[PDB]
Amino acid sequence: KADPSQFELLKVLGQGSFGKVFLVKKISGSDARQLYAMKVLKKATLKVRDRVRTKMERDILVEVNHPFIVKLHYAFQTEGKLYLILDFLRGGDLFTRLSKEVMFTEEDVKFYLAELALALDHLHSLGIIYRDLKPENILLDEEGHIKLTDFGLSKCGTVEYMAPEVVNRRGHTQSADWWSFGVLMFEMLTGTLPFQGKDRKETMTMILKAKLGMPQFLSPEAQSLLRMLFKRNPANRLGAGPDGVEEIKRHSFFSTIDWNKLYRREIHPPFKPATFYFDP
Ligand SMILES: CC(C)CCN1c2nc(Nc3cc(F)c(O)c(F)c3)ncc2N(C)C(=O)[C@H]1C
Numbered sequence: 366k367a368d369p370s371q372f373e374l375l376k377v378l379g380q381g382s383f384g385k386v387f388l389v390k391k392i393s394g395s396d397a398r399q400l401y402a403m404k405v406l407k408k409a410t411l412k413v414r415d416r417v418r419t420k421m422e423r424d425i426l427v428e429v430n431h432p433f434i435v436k437l438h439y440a441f442q443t444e445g446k447l448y449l450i451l452d453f454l455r456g457g458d459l460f461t462r463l464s465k466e467v468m469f470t471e472e473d474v475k476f477y478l479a480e481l482a483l484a485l486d487h488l489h490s491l492g493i494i495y496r497d498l499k500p501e502n503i504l505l506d507e508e509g510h511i512k513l514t515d516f517g518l519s520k521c522g523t524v525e526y527m528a529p530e531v532v533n534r535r536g537h538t539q540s541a542d543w544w545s546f547g548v549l550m551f552e553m554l555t556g557t558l559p560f561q562g563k564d565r566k567e568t569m570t571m572i573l574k575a576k577l578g579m580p581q582f583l584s585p586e587a588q589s590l591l592r593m594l595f596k597r598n599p600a601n602r603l604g605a606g607p608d609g610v611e612e613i614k615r616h617s618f619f620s621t622i623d624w625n626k627l628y629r630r631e632i633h634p635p636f637k638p639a640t641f642y643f644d645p
Contacts, residue, residue, distance in 0.1 A: 367439045369448060372403060383516065384410075388453060401438060404449040411447075419447060425518045426451075428491055432630065433484035434513045435504075454512055456505030456638040459553075463500055468556035471584055473635040477503070478550055479622045480511045485546065486610035488518070489539040496537065497522045498545035500552070509634030524569055525558045529597045532569045540599035543613070547594030554587060555580050559595070573597075590618040 373390040380386070384406035391399045406419060426437035426449070439450035459477065463469065469477075481503065488495060495502075496517040504512045524532065528544035531537050551559045559577055562568040577595055579588050593603040593616075603612050614624055626632050 367441050367450075369441070369443065369446075372401075372450070374403075375400075378402060384447075389450070396438075400453045402451045402453045404451060406447040406449075408445045408447065421520060422515060422518060423447075423449065425491075425493055425520070426515055429488070429493070429518075431484055431487040432628070433480050433511050434487065435515055437515075449515075451515070452506075452512060454504040455507045456509060456636070458505060459500035459503040459511075462505070462636060463553060463556070469553045469635070471554065471587060474550065474553045475619065475622065476627075476632065476635055477511060477553065478546070479619055479624070479627050481513065481546065481549070482610060482613050482619075483624075483628060484511070484513045485539075485542050489542070489609070492520055494519055494537050494539055495542050495545070497526065498542060498549060499523050499526050500549065505636065505638065507638055508630065509636045509638065510630055524565055524572070525561065527569075527572060528599070529573050530599055532572050538599060540602045540605045543594055543602050543604035544599075547591050550587070550594070551591055554583060559591075584618075586616075586618040586620075590616050 371391065371393045373392050375388045375390055378386040378388050384404060387403045387405070389401050389403040391397050391401065411419060423437070423440050426435070426440075430436075435452050435454075437449060437451060439448070441448050485495065495513070496519050498517060502514040502516055504514060506512055519537070522531075526545045526548045528537075528541035531541050548559060551557075560568055560571040560575060562571055577591070579591065583591070590603070590613075596602045599605055603616070604610060606612050608615075613619070614622075623632070
């Protein structure tokens with residue numbers, strides 16, 4: 366029953382390889398006056414191979430139901446367009462936050478990573494992996510909690526976050542997601558990528574071959590988790606073992622986290638998105 370005429374276009378949020386994203390307002394029904402992001406894709410720009418992908422991307426968001434992953438409200442099509450109605454996130458993104466603070470404190474990082482660990486495990490329980498886990502894809506809501514975007518959802522990319530088995534085209538499993546999580550952790554704490562060369566080729570060679578030089582301002586606990594996430598063999602990596610995410614959750618780095626209070630959004634976030642008068 367849902368169609369494009371049921372949504373008032375306010376402003377265009379962005380545009381790229383995906384399609385065009387608008388900030389829309391629902392005009393009809395129970396959720397009338399509610400704001401959303403409308404992702405529009407033109408069928409003419411999608412090829413026979415690109416068609417199967419978008420299909421799977423909608424087929425994934427329908428299965429996904431987690432507080433730290435973007436919700437698909439509606440999805441519909443026309444003769445030449447494909448629409449996805451998703452959450453509108455006011456809070457911003459980690460990319461914009463990190464580029465502003467330069468580096469986050471251990472306490473800030475611990476919060477974002479704990480929230481992300483729950484979202485990644487949910488995806489892995491459904492047989493889904495996150496192809497491009499970078500800070501551009503981690504949005505923040507009105508309260509300051511994370512929301513993982515759908516751009517990287519799967520059953521090309523930023524090489525700096527790619528695991529050795531992915532650089533070497535050997536396969537993207539859930540273990541490759543725990544490497545990118547370490548890359549993300551490292552970047553948040555140092556303000557620098559762990560593997561970075563003079564160009565893309567040297568960076569990729571270093572992801573495969575370079576020993577990581579651990580900056581010593583990193584706490585003993587942060588260093589232990591990174592060393593364990595940065596194993597070249599994916600079967601040796603933290604999160605690949607018998608208890609999976611419980612290996613990450615039980616790590617000393619996360620010992621101050623209450624995984625129950627964090628899930629229910631009872632833990633106060635590091636950032637809270639957007640008085641003088643006096644009389645006796
Ligand atoms: C062009 C896209 C990348 C712009 C992304 N973006 C936003 N996106 C969303 N929701 C949203 C969630 C999705 F899972 C999704 O795939 C999507 F298309 C949109 N809300 C608010 C913003 N605002 C205000 C922004 O400035 C930037 C950060």
